[PDB]
Design an enzyme around this catalytic site. Structure first.
Site, mmCIF file in Angstrom:
data_model
loop_
_atom_site.group_PDB
_atom_site.id
_atom_site.type_symbol
_atom_site.label_atom_id
_atom_site.label_comp_id
_atom_site.label_asym_id
_atom_site.label_seq_id
_atom_site.Cartn_x
_atom_site.Cartn_y
_atom_site.Cartn_z
ATOM 1 N N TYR A 27 0.810 -1.276 0.000
ATOM 2 C CA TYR A 27 0.000 0.000 0.000
ATOM 3 C C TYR A 27 0.808 1.273 0.000
ATOM 4 O O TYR A 27 0.226 2.330 -0.183
ATOM 5 C CB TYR A 27 -1.040 0.048 1.200
ATOM 6 C CG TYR A 27 -2.100 -0.958 0.975
ATOM 7 C CD1 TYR A 27 -1.968 -2.238 1.456
ATOM 8 C CD2 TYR A 27 -3.190 -0.663 0.179
ATOM 9 C CE1 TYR A 27 -2.949 -3.205 1.206
ATOM 10 C CE2 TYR A 27 -4.153 -1.610 -0.098
ATOM 11 C CZ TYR A 27 -4.002 -2.884 0.401
ATOM 12 O OH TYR A 27 -4.961 -3.817 0.160
ATOM 13 N N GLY A 29 2.576 3.942 -1.671
ATOM 14 C CA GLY A 29 2.857 4.271 -3.076
ATOM 15 C C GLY A 29 1.747 3.828 -4.014
ATOM 16 O O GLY A 29 0.590 4.063 -3.732
ATOM 17 N N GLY A 31 0.473 0.756 -4.975
ATOM 18 C CA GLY A 31 -0.430 -0.316 -4.597
ATOM 19 C C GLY A 31 -1.779 0.071 -4.004
ATOM 20 O O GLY A 31 -1.921 1.059 -3.289
ATOM 21 N N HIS A 47 -4.108 5.256 5.413
ATOM 22 C CA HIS A 47 -3.940 6.506 4.621
ATOM 23 C C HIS A 47 -4.688 6.513 3.291
ATOM 24 O O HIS A 47 -5.401 7.482 2.980
ATOM 25 C CB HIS A 47 -2.439 6.740 4.397
ATOM 26 C CG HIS A 47 -2.132 8.099 3.848
ATOM 27 N ND1 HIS A 47 -1.790 8.293 2.547
ATOM 28 C CD2 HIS A 47 -2.220 9.360 4.426
ATOM 29 C CE1 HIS A 47 -1.565 9.599 2.342
ATOM 30 N NE2 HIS A 47 -1.850 10.254 3.478
ATOM 31 N N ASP A 48 -4.543 5.444 2.497
ATOM 32 C CA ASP A 48 -5.360 5.264 1.329
ATOM 33 C C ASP A 48 -6.870 5.298 1.592
ATOM 34 O O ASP A 48 -7.600 5.993 0.848
ATOM 35 C CB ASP A 48 -5.028 3.937 0.709
ATOM 36 C CG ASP A 48 -3.725 3.983 -0.117
ATOM 37 O OD1 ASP A 48 -2.951 4.966 -0.044
ATOM 38 O OD2 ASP A 48 -3.469 2.988 -0.811
ATOM 39 N N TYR A 51 -8.005 8.803 2.241
ATOM 40 C CA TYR A 51 -8.120 9.570 1.013
ATOM 41 C C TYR A 51 -9.439 9.120 0.338
ATOM 42 O O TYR A 51 -10.139 9.918 -0.212
ATOM 43 C CB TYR A 51 -6.908 9.270 0.068
ATOM 44 C CG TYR A 51 -5.673 10.135 0.279
ATOM 45 C CD1 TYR A 51 -5.605 11.049 1.339
ATOM 46 C CD2 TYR A 51 -4.541 10.016 -0.575
ATOM 47 C CE1 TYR A 51 -4.481 11.831 1.542
ATOM 48 C CE2 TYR A 51 -3.383 10.790 -0.359
ATOM 49 C CZ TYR A 51 -3.369 11.697 0.678
ATOM 50 O OH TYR A 51 -2.263 12.496 0.920
ATOM 51 N N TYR A 64 -2.078 22.243 1.349
ATOM 52 C CA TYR A 64 -2.499 22.889 2.613
ATOM 53 C C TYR A 64 -1.299 23.419 3.405
ATOM 54 O O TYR A 64 -0.133 23.192 3.045
ATOM 55 C CB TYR A 64 -3.209 21.864 3.453
ATOM 56 C CG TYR A 64 -2.363 20.604 3.656
ATOM 57 C CD1 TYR A 64 -1.369 20.533 4.662
ATOM 58 C CD2 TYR A 64 -2.531 19.494 2.835
ATOM 59 C CE1 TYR A 64 -0.632 19.362 4.862
ATOM 60 C CE2 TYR A 64 -1.774 18.337 3.031
ATOM 61 C CZ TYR A 64 -0.848 18.280 4.042
ATOM 62 O OH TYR A 64 -0.122 17.121 4.183
ATOM 63 N N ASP A 89 -2.896 12.959 6.305
ATOM 64 C CA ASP A 89 -1.453 12.946 6.175
ATOM 65 C C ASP A 89 -0.721 12.959 7.520
ATOM 66 O O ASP A 89 0.166 12.244 7.710
ATOM 67 C CB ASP A 89 -0.957 14.093 5.329
ATOM 68 C CG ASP A 89 -1.228 13.927 3.841
ATOM 69 O OD1 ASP A 89 -1.719 12.939 3.360
ATOM 70 O OD2 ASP A 89 -0.907 14.842 3.165
HETATM 71 C C1 LIG Z 1 3.338 10.742 -7.105
HETATM 72 N N1 LIG Z 1 4.738 10.239 -7.135
HETATM 73 C C2 LIG Z 1 5.577 11.288 -7.766
HETATM 74 C C3 LIG Z 1 5.266 9.913 -5.776
HETATM 75 C C4 LIG Z 1 4.304 9.173 -4.859
HETATM 76 C C5 LIG Z 1 3.229 8.350 -5.215
HETATM 77 N N2 LIG Z 1 2.581 7.881 -4.101
HETATM 78 C C6 LIG Z 1 3.141 8.321 -2.948
HETATM 79 C C7 LIG Z 1 2.881 8.141 -1.465
HETATM 80 C C8 LIG Z 1 1.725 7.272 -0.933
HETATM 81 C C9 LIG Z 1 1.981 6.448 0.352
HETATM 82 C C10 LIG Z 1 0.900 6.582 1.459
HETATM 83 O O1 LIG Z 1 -0.341 5.802 1.351
HETATM 84 C C11 LIG Z 1 3.745 8.832 -0.596
HETATM 85 C C12 LIG Z 1 4.801 9.643 -1.054
HETATM 86 C C13 LIG Z 1 5.079 9.835 -2.419
HETATM 87 C C14 LIG Z 1 4.285 9.188 -3.367
#
Ligand SMILES: CN(C)Cc1c[nH]c2c(CCCO)cccc12
Length: 121
Positions: A27, A29, A31, A47-48, A51, A64, A89
């Protein structure tokens, strides 16, 4: 936005968001599938889900403001999407700090096919 999220993580953990937490487990990134591999991965799952409760907000790009009150994260008043994104966050960054002791490098670059199972928010 990712800009604030990234800075919050580095401040909390001493680790850089990319690549400690952008390709970790199932999860953190990209996933969004399977069972979270450990406690850090569970932070990313929650966190996902956080969101996922804001279908009309844009948490990657909407910025923010937040401040530190001796260490504590305080979200500043913005639009209501901004306030709620900040709370998601802040929770994740604290979750990460709280589980720094079990963070394993074995879960960096974790392969997709091993992200198996179901888990609803
Ligand atoms: C968009 N890319 C440039 C980088 C990126 C994609 N997903 C991220 C998460 C998600 C982790 C928390 O659920 C945290 C930090 C950076 C990234």
């Amino acid at each position: 936005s990712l800009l604030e999220f990234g800075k919050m993580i580095l401040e909390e953990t001493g680790k850089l968001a990319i690549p400690s937490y952008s390709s970790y487990g199932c999860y953190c990134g990209w996933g969004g599938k399977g069972t979270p591999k450990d406690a850090t991965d569970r932070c990313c799952f929650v966190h996902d889900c956080c969101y996922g409760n804001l279908p009309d907000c844009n948490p990657k790009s909407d910025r923010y403001k937040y401040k530190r009150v001796n260490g504590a994260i305080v979200c500043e008043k913005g639009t209501s999407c901004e306030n709620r994104i900040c709370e998601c966050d802040k929770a994740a960054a604290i979750c990460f700090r709280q589980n720094l002791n079990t963070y394993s490098k074995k879960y960096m670059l974790y392969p997709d096919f091993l992200c198996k199972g179901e888990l609803k928010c």
